[PDB]
């Protein structure tokens, strides 16, 4: 309805922006496709909508929208549902396109990512490429060590990801501190295969 | 007028949101009813309205809207009206529905609640259920001990509540510090019946 | 133009708010008059307008709008115009109505006030009433001592005031620290007449 | 399209603002010209547009819009493109008019400036005037010493500048710390000609 119109009017706004800045045709179409995969023809002022509600209704909503994500990921599926709800209410949906570098190996990490749908490639100068996909997560190491990205991560397909910031990642682990051990265990496993080890875990 | 229209257009926005995320029929009606109890057919950009005013007019307004809350609650009714005004200007109105868990026993507390209208149930694994209702308040213990919720609290009816955040709760007790003793006294009483005691009070 | 319409539509929004909360007739008219003295039939999204500009244009604008305030107040009139400009760009315009208590004697101070037009009464339990008016300022003591209001201040007429917050008051005195001595001198004078003295000045 | 209309309606809003505050004719035209050089007939809610996108698309966009700035400025042109991208995503576009004092010699520095197009004059009481122009930058010293502006800087022509705040300047140099040495080297050179020296560099 008026969400279909909001999508349209917002995209025309994007169209005049690229017109104004004279971006090439291929870049414009790339932005067109992002816009279609990410919003799918409707646009919602989601912060304002859920802010009209209360905690229980918001929590009931995120749990419904993410049933598949929760169900297919053992970390969430077997955890205390209150831990899950706390994580879910802070996830932010993001779409990446084939070839995008989601994470660069040198940099500082400010967020981790949960793969709802898609394939990514884990890359280090000096090892092979492992694939991660639906039900998996990545970017957690830098969050735990407070260090620097131990690899680059690259979208292979269109990716529908849910991201979690370092602050919210930590606010949720102060609460429910048993769950940090669950993250470190897999992080230790993954480091041991990329020829790495680290005392901090 | 245009507040009746704002209610309508905002709710249709909510309607397309649940349509987009394919929520079941019972959940949609539950959200419909919340929306009717909480906004009652009109929607006001209340932050912007009261921000157009000045301190005295804002203070005169909250005191008028809350005469009954103040009058039926001894803590406010017999306190220094400036203490009351300071508390009132930071309360945030909230509606909960039957069955909602307002507070879960394990968690960290970030706010307390004043009952304008409604009945709630106080619940601990290992004690009976006490009811609280109009003129009463709850969630104050965690605010004082800076600890962890000593019980769960559950809406029995539709509840019209006014919430107060930990920060504002503390900003108002630094000012007017005699009023903290008033909170602790009742908190000590309530702990002594749920078989509990605590040195911090 | 569309600022006259914005005034109208915004006020009708206020009208439905008081209708919804059933405020009495005298309080509604009091709010009507405030709205007319404060906005004078036009409403401007002033943060957004001046944010479209740059520093020099903003500084040239506040200096023009406040020529009279600056010219009739020795503190500003003889100060370094850069000090003045720094103060001016942080002033916030406020209107008070006869009888309003602008400052209550017990409380914590978070701002001071510069009188563009109007008369106020300085009040302490145990002294006479001094009047301040156009070209004068007040609320500065608590800002300097970081203490507690040494008196109440009460609008006698409609007052057009410019307020300055404690933070901005301090950001401007770290810069230009010679000007704090100018404030303390008058504050020491005013304390000595209300039978008071204070070491911190 | 609707960006051309947004320019128009926004400018009429500015027009009623100056009408309301009765600004003289020359000042109004000065604001008219600023508005034309700065927005060029179109207005975009740029924060919201780029916020609809993702990191890679935003980074690809700033890099395209600033190809000339990057290419003509050795500091950026020969640096690690990730350093550049980090700087670019935090630049804020600004237009200054002939005669404006961009930086005053006494003051505290909160930002530096990169000259996309324009000529400025570097001024100290007690030295000659050096000109800087396209491809050059200034305001970096105060950012490095955390001190006080070592000179005034004055627009000679219309200037199209990109500014960088002290915080973002520092967030980017914690990352990529080799680039601070590049700034200090030129800062040391520039100080040595204005008869100055400083241990902190
Ligand atoms: N054998 C490995 C090693 C690392 N990784 C992920 O790559 C991420 C890159 O950034 P990070 O924040 O260091 O966390 C890393 C792992 O999730 C992985 O998925 N498999
Ligand atoms: N006998 C008792 C014990 C506790 N309570 C309230 O339950 C709240 C649960 O969270 P809280 O923040 O620990 O504060 C508690 C009391 O208000 C109560 O109302 N009666
Ligand atoms: N003789 C006096 C004493 C005090 N005052 C002002 O009253 C203000 C009340 O709050 P304040 O922040 O303590 O600063 C005080 C003086 O400006 C005044 O105007 N004349
Ligand atoms: N010989 C010099 C000396 C100083 N400058 C610039 O002037 C700026 C004024 O503020 P700043 O922040 O101290 O940084 C200074 C230099 O960029 C310059 O461009 N050439």
GROMACS .gro file of N, CA, C and O in nm, chain A residues 70 73-88 112 114 137 140 143-144 164 168-188 201, chain B residues 148:
model
  188
   70UNK      N    1   1.703  -1.918   1.394
   70UNK     CA    2   1.717  -1.984   1.524
   70UNK      C    3   1.717  -2.136   1.508
   70UNK      O    4   1.802  -2.205   1.566
   73UNK      N    5   2.043  -2.308   1.349
   73UNK     CA    6   2.174  -2.275   1.403
   73UNK      C    7   2.184  -2.328   1.545
   73UNK      O    8   2.122  -2.271   1.637
   74UNK      N    9   2.260  -2.437   1.566
   74UNK     CA   10   2.265  -2.501   1.699
   74UNK      C   11   2.292  -2.407   1.814
   74UNK      O   12   2.235  -2.425   1.923
   75UNK      N   13   2.377  -2.306   1.794
   75UNK     CA   14   2.408  -2.212   1.901
   75UNK      C   15   2.281  -2.152   1.958
   75UNK      O   16   2.264  -2.145   2.080
   76UNK      N   17   2.191  -2.107   1.870
   76UNK     CA   18   2.064  -2.050   1.914
   76UNK      C   19   1.963  -2.158   1.949
   76UNK      O   20   1.888  -2.145   2.045
   77UNK      N   21   1.959  -2.266   1.870
   77UNK     CA   22   1.848  -2.361   1.881
   77UNK      C   23   1.846  -2.429   2.017
   77UNK      O   24   1.739  -2.455   2.072
   78UNK      N   25   1.963  -2.457   2.073
   78UNK     CA   26   1.976  -2.523   2.203
   78UNK      C   27   2.004  -2.427   2.316
   78UNK      O   28   2.024  -2.472   2.429
   79UNK      N   29   2.011  -2.297   2.290
   79UNK     CA   30   2.036  -2.207   2.401
   79UNK      C   31   1.906  -2.175   2.474
   79UNK      O   32   1.796  -2.208   2.428
   80UNK      N   33   1.921  -2.110   2.589
   80UNK     CA   34   1.811  -2.053   2.665
   80UNK      C   35   1.736  -1.949   2.582
   80UNK      O   36   1.796  -1.849   2.541
   81UNK      N   37   1.606  -1.968   2.558
   81UNK     CA   38   1.534  -1.878   2.466
   81UNK      C   39   1.544  -1.732   2.504
   81UNK      O   40   1.528  -1.645   2.417
   82UNK      N   41   1.571  -1.702   2.632
   82UNK     CA   42   1.588  -1.563   2.672
   82UNK      C   43   1.719  -1.507   2.619
   82UNK      O   44   1.726  -1.390   2.580
   83UNK      N   45   1.826  -1.588   2.622
   83UNK     CA   46   1.949  -1.548   2.555
   83UNK      C   47   1.921  -1.517   2.409
   83UNK      O   48   1.956  -1.409   2.360
   84UNK      N   49   1.853  -1.610   2.339
   84UNK     CA   50   1.820  -1.591   2.198
   84UNK      C   51   1.743  -1.462   2.177
   84UNK      O   52   1.778  -1.379   2.091
   85UNK      N   53   1.636  -1.442   2.254
   85UNK     CA   54   1.555  -1.321   2.237
   85UNK      C   55   1.641  -1.197   2.255
   85UNK      O   56   1.634  -1.103   2.175
   86UNK      N   57   1.728  -1.197   2.355
   86UNK     CA   58   1.816  -1.082   2.375
   86UNK      C   59   1.904  -1.057   2.252
   86UNK      O   60   1.916  -0.943   2.205
   87UNK      N   61   1.963  -1.164   2.195
   87UNK     CA   62   2.041  -1.147   2.071
   87UNK      C   63   1.952  -1.099   1.956
   87UNK      O   64   1.988  -1.005   1.883
   88UNK      N   65   1.836  -1.164   1.937
   88UNK     CA   66   1.753  -1.132   1.821
   88UNK      C   67   1.714  -0.986   1.818
   88UNK      O   68   1.717  -0.924   1.712
  112UNK      N   69   2.977  -0.875   1.428
  112UNK     CA   70   2.977  -1.009   1.370
  112UNK      C   71   2.852  -1.029   1.285
  112UNK      O   72   2.762  -0.945   1.283
  114UNK      N   73   2.557  -1.320   1.118
  114UNK     CA   74   2.488  -1.449   1.115
  114UNK      C   75   2.427  -1.468   0.977
  114UNK      O   76   2.357  -1.379   0.926
  137UNK      N   77   2.786  -1.866   1.128
  137UNK     CA   78   2.816  -1.729   1.165
  137UNK      C   79   2.967  -1.705   1.156
  137UNK      O   80   3.047  -1.799   1.152
  140UNK      N   81   3.322  -1.353   1.472
  140UNK     CA   82   3.312  -1.359   1.617
  140UNK      C   83   3.448  -1.346   1.687
  140UNK      O   84   3.454  -1.299   1.801
  143UNK      N   85   3.562  -1.006   1.787
  143UNK     CA   86   3.474  -0.962   1.895
  143UNK      C   87   3.520  -1.015   2.030
  143UNK      O   88   3.509  -0.946   2.132
  144UNK      N   89   3.573  -1.137   2.033
  144UNK     CA   90   3.614  -1.200   2.158
  144UNK      C   91   3.754  -1.155   2.199
  144UNK      O   92   3.776  -1.118   2.315
  164UNK      N   93   2.553  -0.809   1.429
  164UNK     CA   94   2.551  -0.779   1.572
  164UNK      C   95   2.677  -0.699   1.605
  164UNK      O   96   2.788  -0.746   1.579
  168UNK      N   97   2.660  -0.449   2.156
  168UNK     CA   98   2.546  -0.535   2.185
  168UNK      C   99   2.591  -0.679   2.208
  168UNK      O  100   2.536  -0.749   2.294
  169UNK      N  101   2.689  -0.725   2.130
  169UNK     CA  102   2.749  -0.855   2.156
  169UNK      C  103   2.797  -0.866   2.300
  169UNK      O  104   2.785  -0.972   2.362
  170UNK      N  105   2.853  -0.757   2.354
  170UNK     CA  106   2.905  -0.763   2.491
  170UNK      C  107   2.794  -0.744   2.594
  170UNK      O  108   2.792  -0.814   2.696
  171UNK      N  109   2.699  -0.651   2.569
  171UNK     CA  110   2.584  -0.636   2.658
  171UNK      C  111   2.511  -0.768   2.678
  171UNK      O  112   2.460  -0.795   2.787
  172UNK      N  113   2.505  -0.850   2.573
  172UNK     CA  114   2.435  -0.978   2.584
  172UNK      C  115   2.521  -1.086   2.649
  172UNK      O  116   2.467  -1.182   2.705
  173UNK      N  117   2.654  -1.073   2.646
  173UNK     CA  118   2.734  -1.177   2.709
  173UNK      C  119   2.765  -1.148   2.855
  173UNK      O  120   2.792  -1.242   2.931
  174UNK      N  121   2.757  -1.022   2.899
  174UNK     CA  122   2.761  -0.993   3.043
  174UNK      C  123   2.647  -1.064   3.114
  174UNK      O  124   2.667  -1.143   3.206
  175UNK      N  125   2.525  -1.032   3.074
  175UNK     CA  126   2.414  -1.126   3.086
  175UNK      C  127   2.457  -1.259   3.024
  175UNK      O  128   2.537  -1.260   2.930
  176UNK      N  129   2.402  -1.370   3.071
  176UNK     CA  130   2.423  -1.499   3.004
  176UNK      C  131   2.570  -1.522   2.971
  176UNK      O  132   2.604  -1.544   2.854
  177UNK      N  133   2.658  -1.527   3.071
  177UNK     CA  134   2.801  -1.536   3.039
  177UNK      C  135   2.846  -1.676   3.000
  177UNK      O  136   2.956  -1.690   2.941
  178UNK      N  137   2.766  -1.779   3.029
  178UNK     CA  138   2.796  -1.913   2.982
  178UNK      C  139   2.804  -1.920   2.830
  178UNK      O  140   2.871  -2.009   2.776
  179UNK      N  141   2.736  -1.829   2.759
  179UNK     CA  142   2.734  -1.838   2.614
  179UNK      C  143   2.864  -1.790   2.552
  179UNK      O  144   2.892  -1.825   2.437
  180UNK      N  145   2.946  -1.713   2.624
  180UNK     CA  146   3.074  -1.677   2.565
  180UNK      C  147   3.161  -1.800   2.545
  180UNK      O  148   3.228  -1.813   2.442
  181UNK      N  149   3.159  -1.893   2.641
  181UNK     CA  150   3.237  -2.015   2.624
  181UNK      C  151   3.195  -2.088   2.498
  181UNK      O  152   3.280  -2.144   2.428
  182UNK      N  153   3.066  -2.086   2.465
  182UNK     CA  154   3.022  -2.151   2.342
  182UNK      C  155   3.086  -2.086   2.219
  182UNK      O  156   3.130  -2.157   2.128
  183UNK      N  157   3.096  -1.952   2.216
  183UNK     CA  158   3.164  -1.886   2.104
  183UNK      C  159   3.313  -1.919   2.098
  183UNK      O  160   3.369  -1.943   1.990
  184UNK      N  161   3.381  -1.918   2.213
  184UNK     CA  162   3.526  -1.939   2.213
  184UNK      C  163   3.563  -2.077   2.163
  184UNK      O  164   3.660  -2.091   2.086
  185UNK      N  165   3.486  -2.179   2.203
  185UNK     CA  166   3.511  -2.317   2.162
  185UNK      C  167   3.520  -2.329   2.010
  185UNK      O  168   3.617  -2.386   1.958
  186UNK      N  169   3.421  -2.276   1.938
  186UNK     CA  170   3.426  -2.281   1.792
  186UNK      C  171   3.539  -2.192   1.738
  186UNK      O  172   3.605  -2.228   1.640
  187UNK      N  173   3.562  -2.076   1.801
  187UNK     CA  174   3.670  -1.988   1.759
  187UNK      C  175   3.806  -2.056   1.775
  187UNK      O  176   3.892  -2.046   1.687
  188UNK      N  177   3.826  -2.126   1.887
  188UNK     CA  178   3.949  -2.202   1.905
  188UNK      C  179   3.962  -2.309   1.797
  188UNK      O  180   4.071  -2.328   1.741
  201UNK      N  181   4.213  -1.700   2.409
  201UNK     CA  182   4.103  -1.795   2.416
  201UNK      C  183   4.149  -1.923   2.487
  201UNK      O  184   4.105  -1.953   2.599
  349UNK      N  185   1.968  -0.807   4.075
  349UNK     CA  186   1.895  -0.885   3.976
  349UNK      C  187   1.753  -0.909   4.025
  349UNK      O  188   1.729  -0.923   4.146
   0.00000   0.00000   0.00000
